[PDB]
Design a protein around this motif. Structure first.
Motif, PDB file in Angstrom:
ATOM      1  N   UNK A  39       0.826  -1.199   0.000  1.00 44.45           N
ATOM      2  CA  UNK A  39       0.000   0.000   0.000  1.00 44.45           C
ATOM      3  C   UNK A  39       0.863   1.254   0.000  1.00 44.45           C
ATOM      4  N   UNK A  84       2.407   1.617  -3.468  1.00 45.02           N
ATOM      5  CA  UNK A  84       1.397   2.067  -4.416  1.00 45.02           C
ATOM      6  C   UNK A  84       1.084   3.542  -4.213  1.00 45.02           C
ATOM      7  N   UNK A  85       0.964   3.971  -2.956  1.00 42.08           N
ATOM      8  CA  UNK A  85       0.714   5.380  -2.683  1.00 42.08           C
ATOM      9  C   UNK A  85       1.858   6.252  -3.176  1.00 42.08           C
ATOM     10  N   UNK A 134       1.781   6.327  -7.041  1.00 39.63           N
ATOM     11  CA  UNK A 134       0.653   7.122  -7.512  1.00 39.63           C
ATOM     12  C   UNK A 134       0.898   8.602  -7.258  1.00 39.63           C
TER      13      UNK A 134
END
Lengths: 50, 49
Positions: A1, A4-5, A8
């Motif tokens: 997570x 991914x954060x 992004x």
């Protein structure tokens, strides 16, 4: 997570820059067509060709 | 006494077999839980993307 954060977030800024510029480019074509669009709008409001 | 010695040895062997089966099932459950949680993590990462 977290990965991914981070990815992004990096993509977003990359996109924020690209957008910004893309917008400046378009801003130009915008200022090119502004004259014709304004003439058309003036003709519309006046009820006759300007 | 002989029966108790034999039954104690048998009980220890049965305990060893039960422990082997239990740890095999525990490894299976660990794999299942790891797969489920990795799938959840992948789904959440895809949702974030």
């Amino acid at each position: 997570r977290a990965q991914a954060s981070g990815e992004v977030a990096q993509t977003l800024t990359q996109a924020d820059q690209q957008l910004s510029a893309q917008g400046d480019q378009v801003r130009s074509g915008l200022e090119s067509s502004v004259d014709g669009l304004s003439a058309k709008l003036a003709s519309r409001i006046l009820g006759v060709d300007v | 006494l002989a029966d108790a010695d034999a039954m104690h040895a048998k009980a220890l062997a049965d305990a060893k077999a039960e422990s082997e089966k239990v740890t095999e099932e525990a490894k299976q459950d660990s794999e299942r839980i790891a797969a489920q949680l990795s799938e959840q993590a992948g789904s959440e990462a895809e949702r974030i993307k």
